[PDB]
A paper describes a structure:
Polyubiquitylated proteins in isolation can be direct targets of the proteasome, whereas those embedded into membranes or assembled into multisubunit complexes need to be extracted or segregated by the conserved AAA-family ATPase Cdc48 (yeast) or p97/VCP (metazoan) with the aid of its cofactor complex, [name]–[name] (UN), prior to the proteasomal degradation. Here, we present the crystal structures of yeast [name] (zf-[name]-[name]-[name]) in complex with Lys48-linked diubiquitin (K48-Ub2) and with [name] at 2.55 and 1.58 Å resolutions, respectively. The crystal structures reveal that the distal and proximal Ub (Ubdist and Ubprox, respectively) moieties of K48-Ub2 interact with the C-terminal helix and N-terminal loop (N loop) of [name] [name], respectively, and that [name] binds to the groove of [name] corresponding to the catalytic groove of JAMM.
The region containing residues 113–580 of [name] [name] (yNpl4113–580, with the prefix “y” indicating [name] proteins) specifically recognizes K48 chains in vitro. The triple E123A K124A E125A mutation was introduced to reduce excess surface conformational entropy. The yNpl4113–580 (E123A K124A E125A) protein yielded high-quality crystals, and its structure was determined at 1.72 Å resolution by the single-wavelength anomalous diffraction (SAD) method using the zinc edge. The yNpl4113–580 structure consists of three subdomains, zf-[name], [name], and [name], similarly to the previously reported structures of [name]. The yNpl4 [name] subdomain consists of the [name] core and two insertions, Ins-1 (residues 287–317) and Ins-2 (residues 403–462), similarly to other [name] DUBs.
Author numbering: 113 to 181, 190 to 580
Write the structure that this text describes.
């Protein structure tokens, strides 16, 4: 199929980085030579100098293309061919040079598919965190939004988060669980509706928050260099999500390469403050997990390597173990290795207030988010009436716009199946269009809307 607009745009950018004249330059200020010519966007020293921890995907792709001047990209695959009949019976009855997996060497991935996670409004994050503040129990959510150019790294991409949807879940003081099938079925419906709003499911976010007992609002720092950043189970979760949300690329043999799906953790920083850390996992991680080669066990920082079975062939596995200077040495990754090596890190932030606001939803709060009944925040007629009824008859379109421009409000209204599909589209336009007044005028006049407001009137 086609690539995202952001990938098409960045393919058409050259990412050149002009340089000052060098000492060694034997020419004028406007001349050029090997010492002062523009750097390519993937230039390692530039990234090191500027403390950019990974090069961007398009810097990486342009680097591969230059060095190969065959699809430059290919998703790694560590699975044994269980149907090789090249002069033997297939695994586990036989093996040959064509089907036998060779030794795997793991290392920190030098590029990242997404460079930055931008939350459109701090209220989005703060209302998610409120689930934990209110209950003392952890929380999981899916992030909706889109991808755009990020100019603070060469050819960078940012995930732009517009909303968070929390799936049904069983939260506890020190973790949480989900019914995988239940969540999948629900997210299928939410994905479809979010798509009608111009949103994609672009990542996941979860808390690891524990009050530090100082009456400060301060929290413990659990995740740091001497413990772990993401646990092996979390890395496996992230890999599975990435593989299920593949990034389309015409430059890969398979038509896809890795994923733009991002993983965020809200937890204490070293100063005891609530902060966000953002990650993806490497394509090596994707392939390890697809081949069912790693598991979580005793120590959360370590990825445990699984055994060879009838279904799974596990070759020798090495990793490029780093010292404090960043110098690596090849070591045996078995029986377990630090899962750190499977991560890439992303920056995160919020738009500045005077940046041109292109936020999809005017309000992030005010109407209960989904799956918060146990928090005392139900989505009912009583709640919708309280939220919306008086404004809906005031003639105040500014306030009405503010009320309906709200992701969780929209999903709840659509679930009532009062509005027609045309009226539903009208309501979406009223919520997310820059010029929304004409749409809202149509909606308010529609039979479906009138029906809804009347239903609100009679309830209570
Ligand atoms: Zn020069
Ligand atoms: Zn074979």
């Amino acid at each position: 199929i086609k690539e995202l607009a952001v990938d098409e745009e960045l393919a058409a950018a050259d990412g050149l980085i002009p340089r000052q004249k060098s000492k060694l330059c034997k020419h004028g200020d406007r001349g050029m030579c090997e010492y002062c010519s523009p750097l390519p966007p993937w230039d390692k020293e530039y990234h090191e100098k500027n403390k950019i921890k990974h090069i961007s995907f398009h810097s990486y792709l342009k680097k591969l293309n230059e060095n190969a001047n065959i699809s430059p990209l290919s998703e790694p695959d560590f699975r044994i061919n269980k149907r090789c009949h090249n002069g033997h019976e297939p695994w586990p009855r036989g093996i040959c040079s064509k089907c036998q997996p060779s030794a795997i060497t793991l290392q920190q991935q030098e590029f990242r598919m997404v460079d930055h996670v931008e939350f459109q409004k701090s209220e989005i994050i703060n209302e998610f965190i409120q689930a934990w503040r209110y209950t003392g129990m952890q929380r999981f959510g899916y992030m909706y939004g889109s991808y755009s150019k990020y100019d603070n790294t060469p050819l960078g991409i940012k995930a732009v988060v517009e909303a968070i949807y929390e799936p049904p879940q069983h939260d506890e003081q020190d973790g949480l669980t989900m019914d995988v099938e239940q969540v999948k079925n629900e997210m299928l419906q939410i994905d479809r509706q979010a798509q009608e709003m111009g949103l994609s499911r672009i990542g996941l976010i979860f808390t690891d928050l524990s009050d530090a007992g100082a009456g400060d609002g301060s929290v413990f720092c659990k995740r740091h260099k001497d413990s772990f950043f993401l646990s092996s189970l979390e890395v496996i979760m992230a890999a599975r999500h990435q593989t299920r949300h593949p990034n389309v690329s015409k430059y890969s043999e398979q038509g896809f390469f890795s994923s733009k799906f991002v993983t965020c953790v809200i937890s204490g920083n070293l100063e005891g403050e609530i902060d966000i850390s953002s990650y993806q996992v490497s394509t090596e991680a994707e392939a390890l997990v697809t081949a069912d080669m790693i598991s979580g066990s005793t120590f959360p920082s370590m990825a445990y390597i699984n055994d060879t079975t009838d279904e799974r062939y596990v070759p020798e596995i090495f990793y490029m173990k780093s010292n404090e200077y960043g110098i690596t040495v090849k070591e045996n990754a078995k029986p377990a290795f630090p899962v750190d090596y499977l991560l890439v890190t992303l920056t995160h932030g919020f738009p500045n207030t005077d940046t041109e606001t292109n936020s999809k939803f005017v309000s992030s709060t005010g109407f209960p988010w989904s799956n918060r009944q146990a928090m005392g925040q139900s989505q009912d007629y009583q709640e919708l009436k309280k939220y919306l009824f008086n404004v809906a008859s005031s003639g105040d379109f500014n306030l009405l716009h503010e009320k309906i421009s709200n992701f969780h409000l929209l999903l709840y209204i659509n679930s009532l199946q009062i509005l027609s599909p045309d009226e539903w589209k009208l309501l979406i336009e009223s919520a997310v269009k820059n010029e929304w007044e004409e749409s809202l005028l149509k909606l308010v006049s529609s039979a479906g809307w009138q029906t809804l407001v009347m239903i609100l009137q009679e309830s209570g």
